[PDB]
Design a protein around this ligand. Structure first.
Ligand SMILES: [Zn+2]
Ligand SMILES: [Zn+2]
Ligand SMILES: [Zn+2]
Ligand SMILES: [Zn+2]
Lengths: 6, 59, 59, 6
């Protein structure tokens, strides 16, 4: 899926 | 999602699971409502395969 | 602040001014203790300037 | 300051 992190 | 407007006039989007702004922790987006959560707040431990779609308790 | 754990396992942080979850209402964070209050619960009517620091009855 | 809303 769509994920994120700094 | 709650959005914080901080000192700098920047917008921080808050995980509805914990409603804590201080992450670090990676997030995952719902493919229905597009609310984003921290991985641990929704029981995700590993990056999901990209073909996969994730959905959040509500959807 | 009281924290509610709802039916979905999500955490809701409650205004100490009214101590009611049915918010929506915009909130403002105390720049000392970091409790968050609804604007109307502390007499704030408009978004305050970003440069400014707000402080909550106790602090 | 810091504010927030849905
Ligand atoms: Zn979270
Ligand atoms: Zn959703
Ligand atoms: Zn209140
Ligand atoms: Zn305070």
């Amino acid at each position: 899926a769509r994920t994120a992190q700094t | 999602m709650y959005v914080i407007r901080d000192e700098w006039g920047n917008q921080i989007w808050i995980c509805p699971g914990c409603n804590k702004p201080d992450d670090g922790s990676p997030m995952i987006g719902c493919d229905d409502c597009d609310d984003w959560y921290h991985w641990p707040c929704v029981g995700i431990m590993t990056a999901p395969p990209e073909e996969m779609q994730w959905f959040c308790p509500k959807c």
